[PDB]
Design a protein around this ligand. Structure first.
Ligand SMILES: O=C(c1ccc(Oc2nccnc2N2CCOCC2)cc1)c1nc2ccccc2[nH]1
Ligand SMILES: O=C(c1ccc(Oc2nccnc2N2CCOCC2)cc1)c1nc2ccccc2[nH]1
Ligand SMILES: [Zn+2]
Ligand SMILES: [Zn+2]
Ligand SMILES: [Zn+2]
Ligand SMILES: [Zn+2]
Lengths: 308, 307
């Protein structure tokens, strides 16, 4: 498993696409962990066994699948490589893993639908339902024989990296991003923001997770547009299921409103995506290429609205 | 509050603090209050400290009170554009360190002192003047009503005094070469880590070098005029070498003043550009220091040709 010449070069770029060849993705992840963390961070036999078991617990859904897991992990890699001196030894181990596992066992449905349907996970986890489950799955996979990639850490170190991972996976709940960014934006403008404060640090990691999870909007236009087809294929399926409960779904998830997709994306870029990468770039300036691509894609969506 | 123009231009890296000596203390207080906050030091006590520091700098061409306040401003600019990295203690201590870092400088290098057989060279065998600078800082803090860190706990007071000590010692330019080479390797391999204390000390050591040489990052007129003051000290030291029967290096020899352009060219190539290059790699927001340094190198090339 040696990475080809075009891949070694272009994996350093934020807008890299991991390609259609599924069996190279495990190798691509190991390359990223070895460059970001080091070759002696993990026992290689355990890591691959952990990687393949994680792959097995992702589902064949249009968007929230194995490819998305690795794509999110890669965005994080690109953030780590360009802000590398900021992160602790534990963060260098736990963040890439958190990103790989952050949508483990996704059904293809929102937290909202799980509540409406009354799914068992909704009763077990009231807030951030899928996210608490994703972490639960991550812990459950670590406890399989030979899957403890953190076995050489002390007890203290093990509990700390699992907390990092937990908070990071929970932060991928988009309902928490709005409040979190507001705080960060306020902390940055008043100059109170400080990475040596653990709570402030958690918030910045939480924003990084959001930025990685939304990174499809920071790719080149063709990747962004084609990835959009997979996102809506899931939402339209959820809206179909909402109608089967006798509930009118929001326009976002109604396939009968395909025509309004460009306007819906433009609304999302202005209200969510642009603010996320704007604030991230203020806190971490080397992440600007993400913001730059998001603005280029914003311009393309309004180019589609005008009909050109 | 400062006048409107200073408020705006003090945030710029290439800011010059001006000829008005009695505005410099107020410039420093302003910088301290924006980096750290308005409730870090007791103002009356801080002003008393500053004027005692002022009184213990000497009337020499370059290593004077103006140098001290100018170095502190570069550190202020660095801290303001990398505000999230450093703690409250580190911001407090680094500005103060910068202000105190050349305390009681005579206008002579360590090598002259050890070759003259000066008492300080017997006391401090390595980084002679630098160990003296810190020693002077401690003496000023020990005076009645001068301990600006009196609100701190003992634990915190010791931490900031170590920050100040290490930072001042790093301004020994003989330590810079080793420090930069180590940071370059750690940056390339990816092992560089600011949460590692020893690594963090080195980055601060490089920041101190960068602030200390910041005359090369100003606009050309400032950079060129400041060079007259630097060479005035060096030539005076070169005269003292000749007094001892020792032929000084061309750097300190006033007979070879027409080689200055080439001497400066070689300094930028070998010390200054590599310093700010490495600093920009580790802290990208300090990039304007590099650009400006590159621009002044162009000017020195332009002087050598005659253009
Ligand atoms: O805001 C919309 C919206 C917001 C976010 C969406 O998901 C994502 N889009 C781009 C990138 N990433 C997205 N997510 C990925 C999966 O997790 C949630 C965010 C889709 C539509 C939206 N509103 C609409 C109204 C009518 C028709 C279509 C509409 N679309
Ligand atoms: O390299 C020189 C050199 C290097 C550094 C110098 O001092 C500084 N110049 C610019 C900015 N900062 C300087 N220092 C400030 C004080 O501490 C030492 C560095 C001067 C000449 C140098 N070599 C020369 C040979 C002949 C004639 C003149 C020569 N000059
Ligand atoms: Zn998710
Ligand atoms: Zn996700
Ligand atoms: Zn000095
Ligand atoms: Zn100095």
């Amino acid at each position: 498993f040696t990475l080809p010449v075009r891949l070694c070069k272009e994996i350093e770029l934020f807008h890299f696409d991991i390609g259609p060849f599924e069996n190279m993705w495990p190798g691509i992840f190991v390359y990223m962990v070895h460059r970001s963390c080091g070759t002696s961070c993990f026992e290689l036999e355990k890591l691959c066994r952990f990687i393949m078991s994680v792959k097995k617990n992702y589902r064949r859904v249009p968007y929230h699948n194995w490819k998305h897991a690795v794509t999110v992990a890669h965005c994080m890699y690109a953030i780590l490589q360009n802000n590398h001196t900021l992160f602790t030894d534990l963060e260098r181990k736990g963040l890439l893993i958190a990103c790989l596992c952050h949508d483990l066992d996704h059904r293809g449905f929102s937290n909202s639908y799980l509540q409406k349907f009354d799914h068992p996970l909704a009763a077990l986890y009231s807030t951030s339902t899928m996210e608490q489950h994703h972490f639960s799955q991550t812990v459950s996979i670590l406890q399989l024989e030979g899957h403890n990639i953190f076995s050489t850490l002390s007890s203290s170190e093990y509990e700390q990296v699992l907390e990092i991972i937990r908070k990071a996976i929970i932060a991928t709940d988009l309902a928490l991003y709005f409040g979190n960014r507001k705080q960060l934006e306020e902390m940055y403008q008043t100059g109170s923001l400080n990475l040596n404060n653990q709570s402030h640090r958690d918030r910045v990691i939480g924003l990084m997770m959001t930025a990685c999870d939304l990174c499809s909007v920071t790719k080149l236009w063709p990747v962004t547009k084609l990835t959009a087809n997979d996102i809506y294929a899931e939402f339209w399926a959820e809206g179909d299921e909402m109608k089967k409960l006798g509930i009118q779904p929001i326009p976002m998830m109604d396939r009968d409103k395909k025509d309004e997709v460009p306007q819906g994306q433009l609304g999302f870029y202005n209200a969510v995506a642009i603010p996320c990468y704007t604030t991230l770039t203020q806190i971490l300036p080397p992440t600007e290429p993400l913001l730059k691509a998001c603005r280029d894609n914003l311009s393309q969506w309004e180019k589609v609205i005008r009909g050109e």
